[PDB]
C-alpha cells in the first residue's frame, strides 16, 4: 500500500541525514573519520517485532556495521502510534540492533508537539540513549526523494558502547526491495508446501512416508542409528515446521522416482512445475550433475559407494538443507507463514487461488504473487525511484542516451540502455542511499522479476521512457488485500 | 483489481461494440434497422434516483431517434448477492423510462458456477419483461485499450419496449464539470446550508439591505425581493437552500452593492464574496473583477452622465448586452451549475439533502482546514477519478498512447533545431485528434455533438497529469502515483 | 446479530396480519373459510437464494400449505436494499414459493415513499402479483411483539392460480428457531467432517481407503458389480461432497474396528467423541442392536448371512445414508459448508478453534457453536420471546404459578414450571404465530440445547423469573463474527 | 466476547485484590507497609492525554497517602502488536506522574506462546524502569461477579518510583455524570461552536445588548463585559469556545434580561435558552423557572420597593444567599460541568478540539434530527455504557444479585397483605446496601468518600434498567437487550 513506500522514502532520508551529520548517531567523542549509511528492508530471519526498515552505518576502514531499526508512523494511525513506536523501538533494541529510529509526523490535529512528547518520555523514563526520534512534514511524492529536506532530528541516538561484537558489513540485505534467491524455489513449491502444512494441520497423526528398500538400506550404512527420514530430509527436531518440510520434501521434490540414482542417468522429473510451465523441475541430474556423474563414476567406485556420493556438487542431504532454508526464508519474507509455521491468511489465500484457478502457474496465482512482491516485497519503492529518476532525465531531454542512427536520427540502443541503467544505479547508491555494494547485470534480478510479473514490458527499453513500466498493472497490485 | 466504475465503463464500451457487430442483440428480427451505431456514456444526474452504472445509446437510420439501455455491472467482490440486486436494479431502470437494460455479471463466482444463466432463468420465469439483457464476462485484459473486447458474451438479448431524441444526453463516459462558476468552497458552503436548513427548516430567513429592497420594489413592484434577487419561484427544499446560500455566501449585502457614491463620483465597491477561489489567492467576486466588469461599466456610465441611477439598477440586475451578466442571469446560471455538479458528484440527493459523500466532504472541510486544504483537494480528486469516471478516461489515453509510441517512439515528431525530432504543438494536435478518432470510432466511449481542454485542465489541476502538456514518446504524461491515491480513498 | 431477530419479529407480525386479513394474500374470489398462518425459518435444503423467513398459510379442511418467503430490509442497508429486495422476491418465486413478502422501512432519510416505490416498480414492470410489500415504523423491542401494530400492507399478493401441486402441510420447519436432530451428529463430527474436506481440498488425488478382506468379500456377494466403497458409504456420485463423505465415514465413524461385526458383540467404539466427553460414540451395537442381535441371530442364520444383516434396525448402508443427510443438513443450516461443499469462513473458523484449543469439546469450541446457534440458528428470537413474555407475567405478579408450601409460603414447583412452559407455548403458537403443531416435552429440545451451551442455567426454573436465562452469556454470543 | 472496557475493569478489580493478598507485588521487601487496601477506579479526564484503561489506588497505614498504578489491558483481538503498544503506554503513564504502571495481557496468542515473558524481558533489557508490572491472564469467567479471580498471575512485580493525597480522585470504576446542568443538546451545541471556532478562530466575536454592557460597566467599571458575563479570564481556545457557546446558546440576550418593566411593574421575562431539555418538552431556562427562581425573586423585591434597580443587577449577576445562583456563579459552574462531561465522554481533546467521537456525535445530531433524536439518544447510551464503564457496573449488579436470589428467591422480602412475601422499599434498601458492601469490600471497585441514585437514574433514562425500580426475585431489573445495542455501536 502507501505505507510501505512512505517508510522506504523516510528511511532513505534518514540514511542521508546521518551521512550529512554523523553526530546524529555518534557522541562528540568517538566521532569517526568517515561513515556511510544505506537503507534496506529487514531480513525475515530477524526476530518477530519487524521493523519498517534498517539503516546501516559503515565506518571507514572497518569491516563492521552498526544497524538502526526504523519505525515509521503515519497520521492516519493517530497519536496512539507514538506509544506504539516507543515500545517498538525498545523491541528493536532488545532484538540486538545498535539503535532505533522513530519517524513520526511533525504535528497532529490533536497534538502540536508529538516528537517533543516522544523525546520527553524517552528522556524521562526509558533512559535508553540508543533511540532516535525524527519528525516529518508531508512528503513530495513527485520527487525521487519525497522526504528530502522534510525530516528533522528531534532526538539523536548514541550507539551503546558496551558492544564488544560488531555486526559484519557483508551481512543483511543490501537493497530496500526483496531479492528472491532466483533458482531453487518456484511459485508451485510455495503452493505445495503450504498445501502440505494445511494437510498436516488437519491430520497430525499422519504416517511418515516410506523410502524405497535400497534407499532405506543405504541410510543404514551411513547413519546406522539415525532415523532414515530425518537423515534424507536433514531434520533433527520434531517441530511442526520440520515435519511439514519432511512431507513436502519426500512428496514433492525428492520423490521415490527422483530419489532413484541410476537406471546410466534415470532422467527423473520431480512433481514441482517450473514457473514457465514447460516441464517439472529436476533435482541432482540433467547435465553432468550427481546422477549422471555417478553413472560415469561407476566406470571404475562401487555400486554401493554411489549411494555415499548421492547422499562441490550438493548431495541429497546438502540440497535438502539449503532448499529448506530457501523456502523457509522466502515464505516468511512474503509473510505467508507464521514464525510458528502455520500458514497466514495470505498464505492460505495464495493456496486458495492456486486451488481454485488451475494452480500456481495461473494468471490469478501469478497476479497474487506479483501483488505480494509489490507490497510485501517493497518493489513499489523501487518502481517509484526508477520512475521519478527516469522522468526527471527524460522530461529534461526526451532524447537522452540516444545514439545517432543511419540518418543521424536518434535511436535508443542497448548501449543507451546500459548507460541509463548504470546512472539509475549510482543515483540509487550515492544519492538516495537505498542500496549498497557488497556489467550487464545492474538490475537483472529486479527487472526479470518485474517483467515476469507484468510490471515492466517485454520490450526492455524505449526512447523517451527508459524501462517501460506498466503503471496500470502496478496500480492494480497496489489495490489488493483490502 | 482496478476501479469498480472503470470496469463498468470497459464493459459498457464492449457492449456498445457488440450491438454494432450484432444489432439482433437488442432488436427483434422484424425490428432490424437500416444502420445502427452505439456509444457508451455516463447517466446524467438529472435522471431518476436509481442510478445506472452506465448508458449505451443506440442510433438508427432514423434522424432524431435514440434508444437508451441502462447498464448494471456486477463484480465478483460484490458476491452472489449482487445478482439479485441487478435484477431489481434493471427493473428500476426500465421503470425510470429507459427502453432497455443490460445486466453485465461475472461468468462464475466461487459460490455459483452458472450466475448469468441464473439471472436469465429468473427473468424468464417470473419477471416477464423482455427488455432486460444479460451479458456474461471473463476477466478483463487491462493491458488493452479495450479490456473486455471479445470477453463478453450475450446470454439473453433484449427487445426494446415500445417519441425519443438523439441530440440529448452526455456525449462522454467521463463527466464534464462545468468550468468557471463553482469552486470546492461553494460546494462545501452549499452543503452546509442544506444541512443547517434540514435541521431547522422553519426559523431562518435572510435579510436584504434597505436600499436594495427599495430598488427591487421600484424595479419589480409586486415581487418579493428575496425571490427576485435569488431568481427563484418555487418553495421546494432545494430552492430555499439556494436562497440562503446565495445571500449568505455569494450575493452578500456587500456584493449586492452596485456602486459606491462619494461626492458626485461613482466607483465599483470592490466587494468580495465569502467563497474562496480554488487557487486560494483571494475570495471570489460577482459582477466585478476579471471575469465580469459589470459594476465598473455601470459606474463609468454614471460618471459620464450617460445613465440615471434608476437605469443603473436596471443594468445591475438585468445585465448589459454585448456579454455582461446581471444579478438575475448570474443567479440562475450559478444555481444550474452548482445543482448539476453536486448531483453529478453524488454529494446531494434529488431531495436536496447531502448524501453520505456530501457529508464526508463537509466533514473533511470542517475539520482539516477548509475546502482548499490538501485533504479537501484529495477528496475532490478522488471523487472526480471515481464518480466522474476519469479512471476509465486515463486508461484509454494511456493505452491508446502506449500503442502509438511503442511501435514508433518518434511518432508525430517534426524536424527541429539540429534536424533532430521535436514533439511540437502541431504534434500534440495530431496526437490529440488520433485519440479522438479512437475514442469515438474504436472504443465507442464518445460521440459527436477536438480539444480535451476541459478534461485535461481538471486532471492537470488535481495532479493526475503533468503540468507540461506533452512530451516526446509519451503524449499526455500521466501521474499514476497520484491516480493510486485517488483510487484507494473510497468516498 | 440484531438483523436476524428483527426479521423474525416482522415475520411474526406478517403472519398475524394475514390471519386478521386473509385478503392480503387471497383475491376477493377464492377467499377461504379459515386460514391460519405461522412463521418459520427457511430449511437449508431449499435453494441458494435464502429467505429471511417463511410464513405458512394453512387452509381449513385441507392438508396443504401455501408458503410465503419473507425478505426483510433495515434502514442501515439504505435505499439500495429496496432493489435488492425486488430481485430477491423474484428469486423466491423462482425457487417455487407461492408468494413473497418484502418488508422494508416506511421511510428513509433520502426517500419519503420507499414502499410506494417498490410497489410501483412491481406493478409497472414485473407483472407478478404474488409479491407483497409491507412497510414498518421502528419496532418496540420491549414488547413480546415488537412489530405489533407497526406494519402496514402497501401491496397485497395473490397466490398464482396455475399451481396444481400444493405443498404438504407437514413439510418444512415448524419454529422460527432451528431444531437440531438431537441424536446422530455431534460437535466432534462437524469438526472431523470439515477436517476431511480441508484434507481433500489440498490432496484431491487422495487414495480411497481400503476395507477389510472379509468386508470387501461380503460386498462382492450383495452388490457384485458395485464398487465396495460406494456400496458401504451409500454413494453414487463422484462429486466433492460425496467423496468427503466417503473419507469421513470410513475414517471416523465406520472405522475398520467398528465395521467388525462379531468377535459375541465386539464392543467397538468409533473415533468420534460424544459431546459429553465420556467416551467415543458407538455405531450399530451397545444394547441389543445390529452386532449384538446378529450374535444372538447366530444361535441357529449362517455366519455368511450375518453380513447381509449387517449391511426395523438400520444397517451400515441405511445408517450411512441417513447420517449423511443429517450432517449435510446441519452444516448447511449452520452455514459452515457451501452448496458446492467447500467449507465457509465460519466452517473454517470452527475447525481452527477446535484445532487450536484442544478439540470440539473445548470451551472455545462450545462457545463458537453456541454463538452460531444464537445468530445463525435464530435462538435470539426465541430467547427474546421467552424473556418478554416471562417478564410480563412476573412483573405483574412476582409469585405467579407458585404453590402453597408447608407454611403457606409460595414455592415455584415442577408443576409451576410445567404450567408456565405450557402458557409460553400457547402464547408462541396462538398470539405470536412463531410456531405450529405437527407432556413434559414442551421445549425440551430448545432448553436442552440452550442449557448445554450455557444460555440457560442448570437450575431449570426459579420463582419470579421462570427459565433463568444467562443474558450476559447471550450478549457475548451476539457480539461474535464481527 | 464482552466489552473491551468491561474486561479491563474486571482485570483492574482482580489486580486490586491481588495487591491486598500480596503487597509485595508493588512494594520492595523494606517498603512493606503497615496495612494496605486497594481499589480500582476510572482515571479522571483532568489527567494527561495518554489515557489509561484504569487506575488502582493503594492506601497504607498512612493517613493521607495514596499510590496510584496506571493499568493497561490488552486483548488477543488487538494482536501481538498490542504488547509493544502497552510497553509504550506504560512509559507514558509513568511520565504522566503515576507511581506505577501495570500491563495486563493474555497468557498466549495464536502467533506467540509467551507474550508476558516477552514484555518482562524487554522491560528488563532496555527500559530500566522498575515501576512497571506485568500480569498475565487466562480467559475470564463472566459467570462470576469476579471474572478474573484466580485467573491473573503476576509475571513481573513493580516497585514504587519515589507528597501524595488520599481523598483525591474518582471513587468508582463507572463514571458519575454531573446531574442537573448539562444536556445532550448542550454537548452538541458546544461541540459545534468548537468546530466553528477551530475553522474560523479570527473573525467572530459576540455582541452584548447595550443595557447589559451599561450595567456591567457600572458593576465592574474596568472589566471587559464579555469576560465579565462569561466569567472567564484566559484567552485559550477552550475559553473562547465557552464564551461563544454561553452567549450564543444559553445566556442569550433574552436570557440575560433580568426583568421586564412595564408601567411601574416588574416581572420575570420568561426567557428560554436555545438548548433543549433532555425530555424534549421545552427549551431549558437559566435564573428562571423551576430550579432557580432568581429573576422572580428579584422582580418581587423591586415591586415591593425593597431594592433599587442597581441592587437588582447586583443580585442578578451575583446571586442571592439562602441558595440562588447568579450569572457569574452559574457560568463558572456550568463551564466546569460541561468541560468535565465532554472530556469524560472523550468527545473533546485537552486542546478543546472535538475528537472522532465528538465528531460522530455532532454528525448524528446534525443529520438524524438533533440531540433528542432516537439516534442521538442511542449514541449517548452507547457512550455511557462503553466510555462511562457502565457495562462493568451492570455485570457486577447482575452477578451479585443473581448470587443472592438463586440461593433464596424470597431474599429480603417481608410479610405482606396475605402474609405472602412482598419486596418492599425496605427490601430494596437492604439489597442496595448488600450490593454496596460487595462492590467495595469483595470486588474492590468502589471506596468510601449508599444509594446508587445517580447511576440508576442515568441507566433508567437510557433504558438499560427498568422503570420499576425493583422486583421480587430480581432486585434491579436489567434490560440486557438494550445493553446489547449499546455494546455493538462502536463509537
Author numbering:
A (entry chain B), C (entry chain B): 3 to 265, 272 to 308, 312 to 322, 333 to 459, 467 to 510
B (entry chain A), D (entry chain A): 2 to 163, 168 to 327, 333 to 459, 469 to 510
Q: Could you share sentences copied from the article?
A:
Type IIS restriction endonucleases (the topic of this study) combine independently folded target recognition (‘TRD’) and endonuclease (‘EN’) domains within a single protein chain, cleaving DNA at one or both sides of their target site. Here, we report biochemical analyses and high-resolution crystallographic and CryoEM structures (in the presence and absence of bound DNA) of the Type IIS REase PaqCI. It forms a tetramer in solution in both the absence and presence of bound DNA, recognizes a longer target than FokI (5′-CACCTGC-3′), and cleaves each strand of bound DNA much closer to the bound target site (4 and 8 bases downstream, respectively). The enzyme displays a similar tetrameric organization of target recognition domains in the absence or presence of bound substrate, with a significant repositioning of endonuclease domains in a trapped DNA-bound complex that is poised to deliver the first of a series of double-strand breaks.
The crystal structure of the DNA-free enzyme was determined to 2.5 Å resolution and found to correspond to a compact enzyme tetramer. In the crystallographic model, four target recognition domains (TRD) and four endonuclease (EN) domains form a starburst-like structure. The TRDs form a ring of four C-shaped subunits while two EN domains dimerize on either side of the TRD ring, sequestering their active sites against the oligomer and away from solution and DNA. Each dimer pair within the enzyme tetramer contacts the other both through contacts between the sequestered EN domains and through additional contacts between the TRDs. In the unbound structure, the EN domains are held against the TRD ring via contacts between periphery EN loops and a single TRD loop on its neighboring and adjacent monomer. This locks the catalytic domain against the interior of the tetramer and prevents it from cleaving nonspecific DNA duplexes. The resulting data set extended to 2.5 Å resolution and corresponded to a primitive tetragonal space group (P43211) in which two copies of the protein subunit occupied the asymmetric unit. The designation of the enzyme assemblage as a tetramer agrees with (i) the solution behavior of the protein when analyzed and purified via size exclusion chromatography, and (ii) the same structure determined independently via single-particle cryogenic electron microscopy (CryoEM). 3D variability analysis of the CryoEM DNA-free apo-enzyme tetramer map shows an oscillation between either side of the dimer pair, with correlated motions of each TRD affecting the corresponding orientation of its neighbor.
